[PDB]
Coordinates of C-alpha atoms in Angstrom, one line a residue:
Chain A
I13 CA 94.3 52.2 74.5
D14 CA 95.9 55.6 73.7
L15 CA 94.2 58.4 75.6
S16 CA 96.4 61.0 73.7
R17 CA 94.3 59.7 70.7
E18 CA 90.7 59.9 72.1
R19 CA 88.0 62.5 71.1
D20 CA 87.5 65.0 74.1
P21 CA 84.4 64.1 76.3
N22 CA 81.4 66.4 75.7
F23 CA 81.2 68.3 79.1
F24 CA 79.5 71.1 81.1
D25 CA 81.5 72.8 83.9
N26 CA 79.0 73.9 86.7
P27 CA 80.0 77.6 87.2
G28 CA 79.3 77.5 91.0
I29 CA 82.1 74.8 91.9
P30 CA 85.8 74.6 90.8
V31 CA 86.4 73.1 87.3
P32 CA 87.3 69.4 87.4
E33 CA 91.0 68.9 86.2
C34 CA 90.5 65.4 84.5
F35 CA 88.8 63.8 81.6
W36 CA 87.9 60.0 82.1
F37 CA 87.2 57.3 79.6
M38 CA 85.5 54.0 80.3
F39 CA 86.1 50.9 78.2
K40 CA 84.7 47.3 77.9
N41 CA 87.1 45.1 76.0
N42 CA 89.1 48.1 74.6
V43 CA 85.7 49.6 73.3
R44 CA 84.8 53.1 74.6
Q45 CA 81.5 52.9 76.6
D46 CA 81.2 56.3 78.3
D47 CA 83.3 59.5 79.2
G48 CA 83.1 62.6 81.3
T49 CA 85.1 64.8 83.8
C50 CA 86.3 64.3 87.4
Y51 CA 88.6 66.1 90.0
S52 CA 92.3 65.4 90.6
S53 CA 93.6 64.3 94.0
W54 CA 90.0 63.2 94.7
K55 CA 87.5 60.3 94.5
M56 CA 84.2 59.4 92.8
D57 CA 81.7 56.4 92.6
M58 CA 81.1 55.1 89.1
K59 CA 78.9 52.4 87.7
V60 CA 81.4 50.2 85.8
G61 CA 79.5 47.5 83.9
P62 CA 77.5 45.7 86.7
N63 CA 79.4 47.2 89.7
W64 CA 79.7 50.5 91.7
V65 CA 83.5 51.1 91.8
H66 CA 85.1 53.7 94.1
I67 CA 87.8 55.4 91.9
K68 CA 90.7 57.5 93.4
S69 CA 92.5 60.2 91.4
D70 CA 96.1 61.4 92.0
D71 CA 97.3 65.0 91.1
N72 CA 98.1 63.6 87.5
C73 CA 94.5 62.2 86.9
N74 CA 95.6 58.6 87.1
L75 CA 92.6 56.5 88.2
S76 CA 92.9 53.4 90.5
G77 CA 89.8 51.2 91.1
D78 CA 88.9 47.5 91.4
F79 CA 87.3 47.3 87.9
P80 CA 85.3 44.1 86.9
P81 CA 86.8 41.8 84.2
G82 CA 87.0 43.4 80.7
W83 CA 86.4 47.0 82.0
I84 CA 88.7 50.0 82.7
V85 CA 88.4 53.7 83.5
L86 CA 91.4 55.8 82.5
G87 CA 92.0 59.5 83.3
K88 CA 94.2 62.3 81.9
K89 CA 94.5 66.2 82.6
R90 CA 92.2 68.4 80.4
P91 CA 93.9 71.1 78.2
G92 CA 96.0 73.6 80.2
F93 CA 95.5 71.9 83.7
Chain B
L4 CA 78.6 70.4 100.4
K5 CA 77.7 70.1 96.7
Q6 CA 77.6 66.9 94.7
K7 CA 77.7 66.1 90.9
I8 CA 75.5 63.3 89.6
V9 CA 75.5 61.9 86.1
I10 CA 72.4 59.9 84.9
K11 CA 72.0 58.0 81.6
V12 CA 68.4 58.5 80.5
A13 CA 66.6 56.9 77.4
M14 CA 65.0 60.2 76.0
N18 CA 60.0 65.5 73.9
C19 CA 61.5 63.3 76.6
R20 CA 64.8 65.4 76.9
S21 CA 62.6 68.5 77.8
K22 CA 60.6 66.3 80.2
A23 CA 63.7 64.8 81.9
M24 CA 65.4 68.2 82.2
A25 CA 62.3 69.8 83.6
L26 CA 61.9 67.0 86.3
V27 CA 65.7 67.1 87.3
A28 CA 65.8 71.0 87.3
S29 CA 62.7 71.1 89.6
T30 CA 64.5 69.0 92.3
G31 CA 65.2 70.9 95.6
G32 CA 68.8 72.0 96.0
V33 CA 69.7 72.0 92.2
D34 CA 72.5 74.5 91.1
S35 CA 72.7 73.3 87.4
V36 CA 71.4 70.6 85.0
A37 CA 73.0 69.9 81.6
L38 CA 72.3 67.5 78.7
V39 CA 75.9 66.0 78.1
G40 CA 77.3 63.4 75.7
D41 CA 77.2 63.7 71.8
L42 CA 73.7 62.1 71.7
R43 CA 72.5 64.4 74.6
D44 CA 71.5 61.0 76.4
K45 CA 72.9 61.9 79.9
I46 CA 71.9 64.5 82.5
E47 CA 74.6 66.0 84.7
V48 CA 73.1 67.6 87.9
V49 CA 75.0 69.7 90.6
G50 CA 73.6 70.8 93.9
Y51 CA 72.9 70.2 97.6
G52 CA 70.8 67.5 99.4
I53 CA 69.9 65.8 96.1
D54 CA 69.0 62.1 96.8
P55 CA 70.2 60.2 93.7
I56 CA 67.9 57.2 94.6
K57 CA 64.8 59.5 94.8
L58 CA 65.8 61.2 91.6
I59 CA 66.3 57.9 89.7
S60 CA 62.8 56.7 90.9
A61 CA 61.2 60.0 89.7
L62 CA 62.9 59.7 86.2
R63 CA 61.8 56.0 85.7
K64 CA 58.2 56.8 86.7
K65 CA 58.0 60.0 84.6
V66 CA 60.4 59.6 81.6
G67 CA 61.7 56.0 81.2
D68 CA 64.9 53.9 81.7
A69 CA 67.5 55.8 83.8
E70 CA 70.8 54.6 85.4
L71 CA 73.2 56.4 87.8
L72 CA 76.7 56.7 86.0
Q73 CA 78.8 59.0 88.3
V74 CA 78.5 60.5 91.8
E75 CA 81.3 62.9 92.9
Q76 CA 81.5 65.4 95.8
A77 CA 82.6 68.9 94.7
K78 CA 86.3 69.4 95.6
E79 CA 86.0 73.0 97.0
Chain C
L4 CA 74.9 79.0 66.4
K5 CA 75.8 78.3 70.2
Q6 CA 74.1 80.8 72.6
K7 CA 74.7 81.8 76.2
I8 CA 71.8 83.8 77.8
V9 CA 71.6 85.2 81.4
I10 CA 68.2 86.2 82.8
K11 CA 67.8 87.8 86.3
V12 CA 64.4 86.5 87.8
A13 CA 62.6 87.6 91.1
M14 CA 62.8 84.4 93.2
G16 CA 59.8 83.5 97.9
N17 CA 59.8 79.7 97.9
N18 CA 59.8 77.0 95.1
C19 CA 60.4 80.0 92.7
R20 CA 63.9 78.5 91.8
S21 CA 62.3 75.1 91.2
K22 CA 59.6 76.6 89.0
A23 CA 61.9 78.9 87.0
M24 CA 64.6 76.2 86.5
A25 CA 61.9 73.6 85.3
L26 CA 60.5 76.2 82.7
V27 CA 63.9 77.2 81.3
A28 CA 65.2 73.6 81.4
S29 CA 62.2 72.5 79.3
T30 CA 62.4 75.5 76.7
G31 CA 63.3 74.4 73.1
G32 CA 67.0 74.4 72.3
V33 CA 68.1 74.5 76.0
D34 CA 71.2 72.2 76.7
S35 CA 72.0 73.6 80.3
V36 CA 70.6 75.8 83.1
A37 CA 72.7 77.1 86.0
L38 CA 71.9 79.5 88.9
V39 CA 74.7 82.1 89.3
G40 CA 75.4 85.1 91.5
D41 CA 75.8 84.9 95.3
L42 CA 71.9 84.9 95.7
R43 CA 71.4 82.4 92.8
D44 CA 68.9 84.9 91.3
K45 CA 70.3 84.8 87.7
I46 CA 69.9 81.8 85.2
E47 CA 72.6 81.1 82.7
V48 CA 71.1 79.2 79.7
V49 CA 73.3 77.6 77.1
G50 CA 72.0 76.0 73.9
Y51 CA 71.2 76.3 70.1
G52 CA 68.1 78.0 68.6
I53 CA 66.8 79.4 71.9
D54 CA 64.3 82.2 71.4
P55 CA 65.2 84.7 74.2
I56 CA 62.0 86.8 73.6
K57 CA 59.6 83.9 74.2
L58 CA 61.8 82.7 77.2
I59 CA 61.4 86.2 78.8
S60 CA 57.6 86.2 78.1
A61 CA 57.1 82.7 79.7
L62 CA 59.2 83.6 82.8
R63 CA 57.3 87.0 83.3
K64 CA 53.8 85.3 82.9
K65 CA 54.7 82.2 85.1
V66 CA 57.4 83.2 87.7
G67 CA 57.8 87.0 88.0
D68 CA 60.0 89.9 86.8
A69 CA 62.8 88.7 84.4
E70 CA 65.5 91.0 82.9
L71 CA 67.8 89.9 79.9
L72 CA 71.3 90.6 81.3
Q73 CA 73.4 88.9 78.6
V74 CA 72.9 87.4 75.1
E75 CA 76.2 86.0 73.5
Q76 CA 76.9 84.0 70.2

């Protein structure tokens, strides 16, 4: 999986809250399932295959979570962030 | 205080789903996102995702919570 | 092709819910967002949105509605 080589997620930044710094990409067996945006140095709940997974972000948009077998969610900073 | 919710909805059902989510108390914004416009992203205050999912299934069709994230303000 | 439209509406309780539902369900609308400190302006983004009919509907159904911005 090369994130430098993935189409940008289609997104909408709500104008009332800060703009989230990261793109995220969810894969089952190296096949892209879903994508979107999330905050750096923050946390979110994501449905990853059958399970709710608590995902933590560092300032660099690296995502840690206990993903079920065959699944991963990977983050990177959006242009100019 | 604000939270972002992303919902996958089988979806004119898009117009129906958008109208239902946008009518919810405490909504700041609603957006069709994804290339197929098959996801609704909602931002606001005191939105119960469980209640919103129930309303979508009963009104529009299959719907699944994808992402819930507090606004980092 | 891609449009951003901002409408100030007079919004009195469940007026936001009613205006947001109407705009959200208008043909060509991708996104609706309340903006301004008083959340009394609606930012509408989409493709093929008819701003004249949107303003008619909002005036008939919700209250006074002024076109502040149309951008393409």
